[PDB]
């Protein structure tokens, strides 16, 4: 049956993802004490192909282990909340929502596309691209305590890559 793992996520500026009420996630730097606030995700490996390869990011004409990319589809649930991140059109732009779901039926191998993210990993850094809306990515703001959102801009001020910590 469908493979899954539990994990926390931090954006590339070390902001942890936490619940900001039941209806959204927010990102902020957590002092070691409040680290317990981190939302635990349940990442399941859904239907679709895994790709891998190398891109020559340091431009030396060769490949190195830190240039090996992986691309694999996943769904992101919130451990024991029967909620899934999902991408939907709201007021005409791709939007990130937390969607409640029937525990009986989830998770499954064949996720509806709104739930599917292409997890792209290179040198232990992660992007989560929307399968429904390509070129849109799970993103955080530079500022503190702002919502996690779906953003179609890379390299600007918004953060679009993360690291993952595996949880027991």
Point out which residues bind Tb ion (CB under 5 A): 56, 58, 60, 62, 64
Residue with Cβ nearer Tb ion (49 or 60): 60
User: First-to-last CA distance in the chain?
Assistant: 19
The least CB distance from residue 54 to Tb ion, in Å, is 8
Residue with Cβ nearer Tb ion (62 or 166): 62
The least CB distance from residue 60 to Tb ion, in Å, is 4
Contact 18, 10 (CB under 8 A): no
Residue with Cβ nearer Tb ion (39 or 122): 122
The least CB distance from residue 65 to Tb ion, in Å, is 10
Please state, in angstroms and rounded to a whole number, the distance separating the CA atoms of residues 33 and 91: 39
The least CB distance from residue 155 to Tb ion, in Å, is 20
Residue with Cβ nearer Tb ion (58 or 145): 58
Report the candidate in 32, 45, 37, 50 with the shortest Cα–Cα distance to residue 8.
Answer: 37
Give the DSSP letter string of 33-58: TGGGGBPPEEEEE-SS--EEEE--TT
């Amino acid at each position: 049956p469908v493979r899954s793992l539990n994990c926390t996520l931090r954006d590339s500026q070390q902001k942890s993802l936490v619940m900001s009420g039941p209806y959204e996630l927010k990102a902020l730097h957590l002092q070691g004490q409040d680290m317990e606030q981190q939302v635990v995700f349940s990442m399941s490996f859904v239907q679709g192909e895994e790709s891998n390869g190398y891109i020559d990011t340091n431009n030396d004409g060769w490949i190195e282990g830190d240039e090996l990319y992986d691309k694999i589809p996943v769904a992101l649930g919130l451990k024991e909340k029967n909620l899934y991140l999902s991408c939907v059109l709201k007021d005409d732009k791709p939007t990130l929502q937390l969607e409640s779901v029937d525990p009986k039926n989830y998770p499954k191998k064949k996720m509806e596309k709104r739930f599917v993210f292409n997890k792209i990993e290179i040198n232990n850094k992660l992007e989560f691209e929307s399968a429904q809306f390509p070129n849109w990515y799970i993103s955080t703001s530079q500022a503190e305590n702002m919502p996690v959102f779906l953003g179609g801009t890379k390299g600007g001020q918004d953060i679009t890559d993360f690291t993952m910590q595996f949880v027991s």
